[PDB]
């Protein structure tokens, strides 16, 4: 079994450098060549260079070409690749494969799991919740919707359960959205009317990375 | 350069159906077209590659042809655990491109998106700050755009939105979005408004209230 | 000597619009134009080498085009950090020459100024001087006109201007006006206003005082 | 890693001459071009002259030639930029750009962070802060607007502060402008009509140049 296993650095300051480590396992290091793509948060798949430990050397994707530098040490059997430069448009997904030939021309066979890169200048804030309720008094007659907001935190990820994981169906976590350096997103969730308020509604949002665990129940009013 | 470009961002089809996704390539790319797909993990394995035609390790049930500068991958069983984004890509030039990906979707009736506003919350108006939130949960398709009013018009700045994927049972849509303001300017109006527009009425479904009715 | 021209001298636009600033030479360029960036403090960086086409190690929401004479630089999703003045050059011939340059300024309501008068404080006038300010502050559009008198007159001597760069919490400008008499013709007149007209209302939001009342 | 370091601020007679350095640092010196870019405060960006550390350098702009002079020191990375006979209009920041090379172009890639020249014969005075007390709530109802006039001082910068700084927004501290041969700004501050004078509120105006510190409680009246 062939295995691209990799990692690096992965939170840096704008103007920063990185450098991604690619480990091969299964094969001998120096009968292949490794590609790096990129994959900004919007998908699309960017394809920067191709390194050849062997017949030593490489050959870059205009564009990434000059921020970045492909290496690799034949010894450790480990492909490195390096961002200079850093920027804001380059927190994303790095990807590395195996090329083979085979009739034709090359393709990319094995892919790493690929590092995540997040290029911020922002600094682990812990998030503040606060509950999401009918508001107008006004209901939806029938069934319910109740929320949850998670402002101003970083970095990610969140977790977000309702009643500590009893309630289940009906349950929608958003995507983060990255508000002013910060991150923020929401969870609604929906339950008969006859629950809520009768019957109480719970979020238990936690930010691992500010030692945050908190439980926002859902009352009435405002 | 070479452009690989694949009609077909979304492509919507049912558990069962045999899909076909299509990629073209702005020139004759001579039978070097390699297929990649990407589960939701965000890993992406090799399907098939050499103008298709060619397994790697992956089930038979995947299979590829073409030539010249039309290619499509397909599937003969679509597996739930087929809902990927799949990118065809080019080795017969520097520098090496990628289509731009066609993710799938399941088959779903027209459903119509539930909205909810929700005024700020005391907790959050003490510290002085005030989010307006607007939920639209459970639609179909996906496309969908949300417009904001205070007392009756505009607001476009400080309006956050996020989307789903696609949802594990039911193959609906649900989006936030978020309108945040200072707790001064918020206080200065009384009407907020959250109005969806989706391809399921041609009347704008709106949901509102009055800073004064809580 | 290769003039170069800037089509403006400043453009207004909003974060999350696309900007176009265009550069036009006196003579064919050969397409060796680049482009630099001056942040409000200065500091200025290489943006964009070889006809607005090649960079540095920018943001890829930068770019710019063009050929002969006329070239153009393109920021697309315009974000807070990129409110700043470019300029574009040619190496082609010597001596190498700039563009006039463009600034780039945030879109935001109109709004008049606040404006306050100040008489000259006692310290100040057993130092043999008068000094008389006036503060026009936050007001849009940055365009403004000041305005002496001195029971009822002229006052084109004298006065001393100053303009703050556009805000960055809000998108709005200041200006602070000052009249420098000498005490002696300072006691020699009552009333000392301020007048300031702003494409924001017919009739200036005049202030002033009068020596006898204080 | 590549850069060029300017060299502090010129205060200097008209009549007089003076020489700036550049320093670079982070790649070879004599591989490069050094060019010099004038800036006066009428934004306008200027080129005055190039030249060639490895060689007998020069190649000036038929203006600032014969007026200016640049020279080298291999033996040291740095450049330099003599100015002569000075006058108001030769007042500007002056920056030192590297020349590189790319198929028929060249362009400036790295700038240093400029240095100010001031062409004045004035000497260094402590300035004079003046009380700018509001003497008609006619103006502007409803909040107050203080100010601080700071005049006939040399020579910039001069920082200005309200209550330490525990007083921050609603305050505009204007350019300075150049008025008898002196500097001259003023500063505006607004708070509430409640907080003056009943809480105080005084401007603090710092003087490096002089050893000044000048703290300004505004008081009513005139």
């Known amino acids: 079994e062939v295995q691209l296993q990799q990692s690096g650095a992965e939170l840096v300051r704008a103007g920063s450098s990185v450098k991604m480590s690619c480990?091969?396992?299964?094969?001998?290091?120096?009968?292949?060549?490794?590609?790096?793509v990129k994959q900004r948060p919007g998908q699309g798949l960017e394809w920067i260079g191709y390194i050849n430990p062997g017949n030593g050397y490489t050959k870059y994707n205009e564009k990434f070409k000059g921020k970045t530098t492909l290496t690799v040490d034949k010894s450790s059997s480990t492909a490195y690749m390096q961002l200079r430069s850093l920027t804001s448009e380059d927190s994303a997904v790095?990807?590395?494969?195996?090329?083979?030939?085979?009739?034709?021309?090359?393709?990319?066979?094995?892919?790493?799991?690929g590092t995540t890169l997040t290029v911020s200048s922002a600094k682990t804030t812990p998030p503040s919740v606060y509950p999401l309720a009918p508001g107008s008094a006004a209901q939806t007659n029938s069934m319910v919707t109740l929320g949850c907001l998670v402002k101003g935190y970083f970095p990610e990820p969140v977790t977000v359960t309702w009643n500590s994981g009893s309630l289940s169906s009906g349950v929608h976590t958003f995507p983060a959205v990255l508000q002013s350096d910060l991150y923020t997103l929401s969870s609604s969730v929906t339950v008969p009317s006859s629950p809520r308020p009768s019957e109480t509604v719970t979020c238990n949002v936690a930010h691992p990375a500010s030692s945050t665990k908190v439980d926002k129940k859902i009352v009435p009013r405002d | 350069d070479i452009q690989m470009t694949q009609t077909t961002s979304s492509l919507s089809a049912s558990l069962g159906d045999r899909v076909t996704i299509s990629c073209?390539?702005?020139?004759?790319?001579?039978?070097?077209?390699?297929?990649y797909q990407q589960k939701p993990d965000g890993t992406v394995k090799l399907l098939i590659y050499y103008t298709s035609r060619l397994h790697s390790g992956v089930p038979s049930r995947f299979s590829g042809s073409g030539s010249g500068t039309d290619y499509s991958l397909t599937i003969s069983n679509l597996e739930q655990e087929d809902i990927a984004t799949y990118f065809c890509q080019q080795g017969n030039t520097l520098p090496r491109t990628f289509g731009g990906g066609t993710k799938l979707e399941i088959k779903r009736a027209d459903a119509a998106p539930t909205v909810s506003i929700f005024p700020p919350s005391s907790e959050q108006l003490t510290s002085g700050g005030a989010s307006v939130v607007c939920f639209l949960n459970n639609f179909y398709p996906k496309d969908i755009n949300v417009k904001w009013k205070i007392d009756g018009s505009e607001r476009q700045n400080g309006v956050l939105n996020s989307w789903t994927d696609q949802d594990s049972k039911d193959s609906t849509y649900s989006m936030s979005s978020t309108l945040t303001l200072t707790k001064d300017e918020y206080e200065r109006h009384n009407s907020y408004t959250c109005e969806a527009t989706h391809k399921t009425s041609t009347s704008p479904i709106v949901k509102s209230f009055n800073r004064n009715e809580c | 000597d290769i003039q170069m021209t800037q089509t403006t001298s400043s453009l207004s636009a909003s974060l999350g619009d696309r900007v176009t600033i265009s550069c036009r030479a006196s003579?064919?360029?050969?397409?060796?134009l680049n482009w630099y960036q001056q942040k409000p403090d200065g500091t200025v960086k290489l943006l964009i080498y070889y006809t607005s086409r090649l960079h540095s190690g920018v943001p890829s929401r930068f770019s710019g085009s063009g050929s002969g004479t006329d070239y153009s630089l393109t920021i697309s999703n315009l974000e807070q950090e990129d409110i700043a003045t470019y300029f574009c050059q040619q190496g082609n011939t010597l001596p190498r020459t700039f563009g006039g340059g463009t600034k780039l300024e945030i879109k935001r309501a109109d709004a008049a100024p606040t404006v306050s008068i100040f008489p000259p404080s006692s310290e100040q006038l057993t130092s043999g001087g008068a000094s008389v300010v006036c503060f026009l502050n936050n007001f849009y559009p940055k365009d403004i006109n000041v305005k002496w008198k001195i029971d009822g007159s002229e006052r084109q001597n004298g006065v001393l201007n100053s303009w703050t760069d556009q805000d960055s919490k809000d998108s709005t400008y200041s200006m602070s006006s000052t009249l420098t008499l000498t005490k002696d013709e300072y006691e020699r007149h009552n009333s000392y206003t301020c007048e300031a007209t702003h494409k924001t209302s017919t009739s200036p939001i005049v202030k002033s005082f009068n020596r006898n009342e204080c | 890693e590549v850069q060029l370091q300017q060299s502090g601020a010129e205060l200097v007679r008209a009549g007089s001459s003076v020489k700036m350095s550049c320093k670079a640092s982070?790649?070879?010196?004599?591989?490069?071009?050094i060019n010099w870019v004038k800036q006066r405060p009428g934004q306008g960006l200027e080129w005055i002259g190039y030249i060639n550390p490895g060689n007998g350098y020069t190649k000036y702009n038929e203006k600032f030639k014969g007026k200016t002079t640049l020279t080298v020191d291999k033996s040291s990375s740095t450049a330099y930029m003599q100015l002569r006979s000075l006058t108001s209009e030769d007042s500007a920041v002056y920056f030192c750009?590297?020349?590189?090379?790319?198929?028929?172009?060249?362009?400036?890639?790295?700038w240093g962070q400029g240095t100010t020249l001031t062409v004045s014969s004035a000497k260094t005075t402590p300035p004079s802060v003046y009380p700018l007390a509001p003497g008609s709530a006619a103006q502007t109802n409803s909040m107050v607007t203080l100010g601080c006039l700071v005049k006939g001082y040399f020579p910039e910068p001069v920082t200005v502060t309200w209550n330490s700084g525990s007083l921050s927004s609603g305050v505009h501290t204007f350019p300075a402008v150049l008025q008898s041969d002196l500097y001259t700004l003023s500063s505006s501050v607004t708070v509430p009509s409640s907080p003056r004078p009943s809480e105080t509120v005084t401007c603090n105006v710092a003087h490096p140049a002089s050893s000044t510190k000048v703290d300004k409680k505004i008081v009513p009246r005139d």
């Open positions: 750009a590297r020349s590189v090379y790319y198929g028929g172009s060249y362009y400036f890639d790295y």
């Open positions: 003579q064919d360029i050969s397409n060796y």
């Open positions: 982070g790649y070879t010196f004599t591989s490069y071009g």
